[PDB]
Amino acid sequence: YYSTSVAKLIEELSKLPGIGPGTAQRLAFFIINMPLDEVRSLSQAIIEAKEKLRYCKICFNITDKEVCDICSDENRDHSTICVVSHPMDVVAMEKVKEYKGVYHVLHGVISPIEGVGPEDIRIKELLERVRDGSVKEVILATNPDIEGEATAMYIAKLLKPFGVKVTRIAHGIPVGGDLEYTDVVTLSKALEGRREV
Amino acid sequence: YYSTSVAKLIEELSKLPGIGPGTAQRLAFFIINMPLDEVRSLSQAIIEAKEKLRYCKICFNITDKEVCDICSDENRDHSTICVVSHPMDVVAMEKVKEYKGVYHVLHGVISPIEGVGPEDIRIKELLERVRDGSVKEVILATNPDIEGEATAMYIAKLLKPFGVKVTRIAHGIPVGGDLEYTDVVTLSKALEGRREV
Ligand SMILES: [Zn+2]
Ligand SMILES: [Zn+2]
């Protein structure tokens, strides 16, 4: 079949997302052909990322320290909080280079097979950050999904009673998109949200 | 090479957009194999569409009559005009099923190799429709292009001095899009345009 070990690697690698049995092989071999120092590194890396991983006690983003890097920054507005459902969403948001607020990851909002060793949702703490802080606005940056919606709504409900300006990220036509082509839904929301001048 | 006629058809067909030399052949043969009545139809069709074509004297959309079907409808708000740069944009807009205004195609806004037998731009008439009508709003439904912009702007300028509410179609994240994935620009506009609650 396959050298019992090489067999093994293929299995591990295949368990990965988007990594199919074919591309699995190609990689097993590259790896195996790689230089033992290079190989070690790929290996330390994979394991140390798992144990070291931790979740900011302030915003619940992924990070390696007790409190995340954004949070403990100082050069950033801790009075605008950008709400988000999944930690990658921050890395998306964060390549914007023109946002200066902090964030809040609601976790178990996306709870597919969640609670993986104890992954639970964080709405309560979002409130207490607002209920007990001095927050100006709360930007909901969640999916135009029918799932991204209803979060945006719900949460706008829990926050409305406070003094905060709750706002949602804009839905419509992507920069460099063509309405000639766009989805009707899309372009249908694109209508609903037309803004003066 | 190719039966001189079959040769010919391939040439004509290839002149078409997105129709490449290979797919050209496949079609030539299907066609040629098609039933002479079916073939005639494809043929009448192609030519009659060209001559019959005409441009609504009211909104400058493509149509076969002297004035377009929307325009002469009655069941539609002729006081909301949806501005657009290219007649397909209307067919996009029009599958929305929740717009009840009329439109205006600015033509030579998209003037690539325009003036094809006399295709010229229609901004002036957009004004006179407003300057001499009773129009409530003017929805600019143009591309998040850097080209779609500047139209939206310019035209909002020409109309501002009137009483009209000028509004632009919304830019951001497509319905069923994922900001985890979206373009930075996109998602960067998606920020700029955040709307309360
Ligand atoms: Zn943090
Ligand atoms: Zn018309």
Numbering used by the authors:
A (entry chain A), B (entry chain A): 0 to 196
From the study:
RecR is the most conserved protein in the RecFOR pathway; RecR binds to RecO, and RecO interacts with SSBs, then the complex facilitates RecA filament formation on ssDNA-binding protein (SSB)-coated ssDNA. RecR is a zinc metalloprotein, which consists of a helix-hairpin-helix (HhH) motif, zinc finger motif, Toprim domain and C-terminal hydrophobic region. At present, the HhH motif is thought to be required for binding DNA, the zinc finger motif plays a structural or DNA-binding role and the RecR Toprim domain is the binding site for both RecO and RecF. In this study, we investigated the structures and biological function of Thermoanaerobacter tengcongensis RecR (TTERecR) and its series mutants.
To investigate the significant difference observed in TTERecO binding after mutation of the TTERecR Lys21 residue to Gly, we solved the 2.8 Å crystal structure of the TTERecRK21G mutant. The space group of TTERecRK21G was F222, with only one monomer in the asymmetric unit. Four crystallographic symmetric TTERecRK21G mutants formed a ring-shaped tetramer similar to the full-length TTERecR structure. The main difference between TTERecR and TTERecRK21G was the positional change of loop. The offset angle of TTERecRK21G reached 90°, suggesting that loop plays an important role in the binding of TTERecR to TTERecO. Moreover, we found that mutation of Lys21 to Gly in TTERecRK21G only lead to slight deviations in the polypeptide chains. However, this slight offset resulted in the helix-α (residues 143–163) moving 3-4 Å away from loop, breaking the interactions between the helix-α (residues 143–163) and loop. The distance between Tyr153 and Pro117 increased from 3.25 Å to 20.88 Å, and the distance between Glu146 and Ile112 increased from 3.45 Å to 13.01 Å; these shifts induced the loop to offset by 90°. In the crystal structure of TTERecRK21G, the loop (residues 117–122) flipped 90° away from RecO and lost their interaction with the link region (residues 78–88), the helix-α (residues 87–99) and the helix-α (residues 228–234), which are all in the hydrophobic pocket of RecO. Based on this analysis, we speculated that the Lys21 is required for the interaction between TTERecR and TTERecO, and the loop in the Toprim domain is the most crucial site for the interaction with TTERecO.
